[PDB]
Design a protein around this nucleic acid. Structure first.
Length: 367
DNA sequence: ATCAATATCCACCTGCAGATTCTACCAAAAGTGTATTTGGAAACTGCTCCATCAAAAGGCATGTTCAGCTGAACCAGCTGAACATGCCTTTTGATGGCAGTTTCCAAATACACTTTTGGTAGAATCTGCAGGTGGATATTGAT
């Protein structure tokens, strides 16, 4: 395979110590170094099963080794590494209560937000106590699909199966529930560097950029970006300037700050949507300009590589092409969800009925 | 090699809680009941040729009876191939979003009933003939 990297590494660091070379060149060199050491994540560290399929994933923001996960049957799990304290569990109905959105609480880490097929955007503890419901369908067969949160703004946002989005405060205060789309809202997210423009994606083959404080007039939006197929995810950058989008058939798109309408590059990659599989969500890496996605081969997709395996692919953002591929037998499932740690030293993967941890090996000999 | 105790097996019967689904109120709306009246379809009546009932009888083609005799049914048996049957593998099948069809609803369109004319394509009617139709004779293909 490819993975060639080269450079005059330490020199640049000293160049940075002299002021000659600019910081983005440093960021590029250490991005390459990060890829080189990610070539040693090949040894899969840990595996974890449980009951009904995995649907949503989330990282403990402050802690590297802690992670939370939510199932197809409303079964939530909280798991920490190097603890061995037999991780924490909570069950649900198990049939039609699929948790589908899951973000940690920025305030109380022993709390968590959740969006469920039951029709209940809730705030609940890992010990089982429901602290507070935020919204409700009040009529079954109409449920939520999307959820996200912001701490700098102290806001909650959630999306439906019909095309209307809801926006609440941390203490209630609902001033929202206007309709935005014609179909289900697959993903949604707020800017981390801003507080008052939003992004939402839907089955309508359109992804919309809103201004949550200015617009109130039922599709008096700010921007609307089209696509050729429906969209499973539209995720913001940490920096805030790059919006990543991933469709259902075969595509990834990078939109910029600079003219949201036009895209900067198209990254073709197979992640074909499917009914009983968990929907695929590309994701950023929090401290570089990389992209990470899970692959799902299609015999009809125009493959550039002659070898098409199920594996975790890692591309470069501002170029378009690939830079690394992680693969491990005994894990021949399809990695629906993949998310790097906010810390930057660990990767979590959610496959059907399985959760995988990929971190570096070392510790050749103890003393 | 039998019927007659027992090991084991499995249909039946029971008990109990859960799942399926029979049973049972209220709203929506196609669908069903009165009602008079018309003109096309049943029923009535004659008749009368055309089709059939009857039936007599006179050979004779055809049906009935007996002989006798070899090909057909059936049976003891019965090798060995063909296939049930368990017991383990292996393995494939049951359950667990969306696009692509299928379904309404108004408008716009196709085209098929309607009704008379009239000549004409086609059936009733008969008039000549040749392709059967029957008998008589010569070769042969099965015996």
């Amino acid at each position: 395979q490819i993975l060639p990297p080269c450079r005059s590494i330490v020199r640049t660091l000293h160049q940075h110590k002299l002021g000659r070379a600019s910081w983005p060149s440093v960021q590029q060199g250490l991005q390459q170094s990060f890829l080189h050491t990610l070539d040693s994540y090949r040894i899969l560290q840990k595996a974890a099963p449980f009951d009904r399929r995995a649907t949503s994933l989330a990282w403990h923001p402050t802690h590297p080794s802690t992670v939370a996960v939510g199932s197809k049957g409303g079964d939530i799990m909280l798991w920490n590494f190097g603890i061995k304290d037999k991780p924490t569990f909570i069950k649900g109905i198990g049939a039609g209560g699929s948790i589908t959105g899951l973000k940690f609480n920025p305030l109380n880490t022993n709390q968590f937000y959740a969006s469920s097929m039951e029709g209940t955007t809730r705030l609940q503890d890992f010990k089982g106590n429901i602290l507070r419901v935020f919204a409700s369908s009040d009529t079954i067969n109409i449920w939520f699909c999307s959820l996200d949160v912001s701490a700098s703004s102290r806001m909650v946002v959630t999306g439906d199966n019909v095309g209307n989005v809801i926006l609440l405060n941390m203490d209630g205060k609902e001033l929202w529930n206007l309709r935005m789309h014609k179909k289900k809202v697959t993903h949604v997210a707020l800017n981390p560097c801003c507080d008052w423009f939003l992004a939402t994606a839907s089955v309508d083959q359109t992804v919309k950029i809103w201004d949550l404080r200015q617009v109130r007039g039922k599709a008096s939006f700010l921007y609307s970006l089209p696509h050729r197929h429906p969209v499973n995810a539209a995720c913001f950058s940490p920096d805030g300037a790059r919006l990543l989008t991933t469709d259902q058939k075969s595509e990834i798109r990078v939109y910029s700050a600079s003219q949201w309408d036009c895209p900067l590059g198209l990254i073709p990659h197979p992640h074909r949507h499917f009914q009983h599989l968990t929907p695929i969500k590309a994701a950023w890496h929090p401290r570089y300009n990389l992209i990470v996605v899970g692959r799902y081969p299609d015999p009809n997709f125009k493959s550039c590589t002659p070898y098409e395996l199920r594996t975790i692919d890692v591309f470069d953002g501002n170029s378009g092409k690939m830079m690394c591929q992680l693969y491990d037998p005994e894990s021949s499932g399809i990695s629906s969800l993949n998310e790097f740690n906010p810390m930057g030293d660990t990767l979590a993967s959610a496959m059907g009925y399985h959760i995988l941890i990929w971190s570096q090996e070392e510790a050749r000999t103890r003393k």
